[PDB]
């Protein structure tokens, strides 16, 4: 069949959130209140597109 099309490594470069899981869980409820809108844009895009390559930006 066809060739699967993957994004390049430049498309995956981003400033990673390099904090530990306790730093994430301690800051979790304020992250869920304050970072609501692009997170829900992303997860709606992620359950509608069903393809992570269409959900990168």
């Amino acid at each position: 069949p066809g060739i699967v099309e993957l994004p390049s490594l430049e498309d995956l470069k981003v400033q990673e959130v390099k904090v530990s899981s306790s730093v994430l869980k301690a800051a979790a409820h304020h992250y869920g209140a304050q970072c609501d809108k692009p997170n829900k844009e992303f997860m709606l895009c992620r359950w509608e597109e069903k393809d992570p390559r269409r959900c990168l930006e």
Binding site: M43, R46, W47, K50, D51, P52
Partner: peptide, 8 residues
């Protein structure tokens, strides 16, 4: 229904 993981 929308399942627990999106890739399906």
């Amino acid at each position: 229904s929308p399942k627990a993981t999106p890739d399906n």
